[PDB]
């Protein structure tokens, strides 16, 4: 119900939802994100695809990470921004037509 | 692959040789466990990988069979 | 003549007798256990009996980043990094479960506080646990290590550039632009160092204390 | 502030007979060099503990036996003793 | 001192923490009558959409003398039944955990280094 | 010492090692090829065999036996 | 008296499996002796723990303090820490997963430990 945009995405985080797209998108066979985002090849891991999407869009943040010697601020690629854009492409229909409820309707 | 196949076998015999000198532990469990260790790992390995595994066994022997009373 | 700092009293309205009573107790522990001379920046190995076990001993080696306290409650902090994890223990010199204190490497550093080592690169904090002691020369002055450490990105524990800390062991040139250095100088209180009623002269106190310590021997 | 307050049930760890110093557990109301009132505890537990203590008072003029300079409680670890090793 | 909404470093080898994820874990609850959390106090993390119990094994706030102050707030993940999620801990753990009232022997068994 | 006893006792103990699966434990059963006992596997046969006959066998040549007959002689001539 | 010899005999009498006794060098401040013993089932695990504690109180230790039973909420792993010995009783699968024997036998060469490396944090460009 969050995929189609029915509930505010930040209530779900937008990171436990982008993963869901990759699952269903790959599961349903719609391998369109690879061409749209010029990815190397099909994949099923958010950290990888969102790494590629972020680089493509030239988006990076300054994020505080906690190492063993103390907090350090390190520039990093925007995993959050990619998730939004990955969600906003899906919802715009440029990633293909989907039937989120499948195998529930047939039965 | 190993530092030397002779040393590999030598280590095993040494370990099993001391295997019959333990008092407060399941002697059978010792034998069984050790056998699984050698077999599973040593069947296929590289020079660096095999060097580490044989080294760890070597130190175990030289440390009162890993303090295993 | 190196007089340990804890013996120097702090100024105030407390009676001298309270200090005399404490000194006698402090001298008593020193006879049982010898507390070596060390300064901030020297590496120390302290062996303490753990109370969570059956009198088994524990060892911790690190650079003495801080020394503080007066009397029998004096303490010193020393830091190290273990499997890539910094740790600091604030030891108490006169705690009766400190088995031994060994000065692995005796030296002095540009500053009498090295808390900024928390923000320096890990290399300046890591010291080998198994390192053997280095030689020392009794009839000589302790060496002063003039190393200037390199800091990690600017967000630090404190604003070490500010004039109140007066840190002289950090490479400010690399980590800060001159614009920042100029701005940080807006917190400078030039009058502090030149007002004579704020200085605590302990020369006479140290002289009398030194005689008493030797006399007890 | 500047009010009379009382602290109850403070243990005596040691007495210094030469300088007439008493070591009392924890904190005492008032500033340093402030005069205080010391008397046996009135808490229920220590109701009749003054049996062992000098009942009228401690007379040094009597000189029945000469006290050691420092009196300690048994649990106290005295300085000059061997370092504690919880063996 | 760990509170609600603190950022934590999982010091296990468990997949739940080990796996690199853009967000660190944040504390949602501290299991105490005092809201503050110190060494040996359990807490409930929010880690990758999951709510998981954990135990504090070190923190940056000063403690009593002769105890180790760490540079990061260290935490271990424990299952609901209380068994540790991860099988190894390579970071030093303070020895105070042994005598604190509670169940810490399982964690101590998994920890090789003690400070 | 009994030569037949050594053979049957060596054969007896060799029989017990279900690890070798004595499908064909002929007195000339080739420990390596016939039984597929790796360098490790052939040793444990010796080490276990050593226990039976008061040990005293050095592995120097005990890894070259490769048949019940030879090991029988190896111990028979050593006893 | 309550000592390792009595404990192992007590464990053997109650019929535990794979009892392993690893000595710990004094350098490590955990315990003199480390004991791991497998158990048939959860019921058996509870019985063994209860029996040892009952014998422990009976067998002298009049001055020595009491020992808690830890892991009762857990259904497969129970650990009891005596003053100088620690006993962990767990089911076969739990023993296989955690592999406590290997860690303490091989202090720093455990296979699982080896896989845990160190890292640093550089900027991305
Ligand atoms: Mg701060």
UniProtKB/TrEMBL annotation, chain B:
One GO-annotated biological process of the protein: positive regulation of mitochondrial translation
Gene Ontology molecular functions: mitochondrial large ribosomal subunit binding
Complex 1 LYR protein domain ranges (all copies): 7-57
Pfam families attached to this UniProt entry: Complex1_LYR
Superkingdom per UniProt: Eukaryota
GO cellular component, one term: mitochondrial matrix
UniProt protein name: Predicted gene, 55359
Native source species: Mus musculus
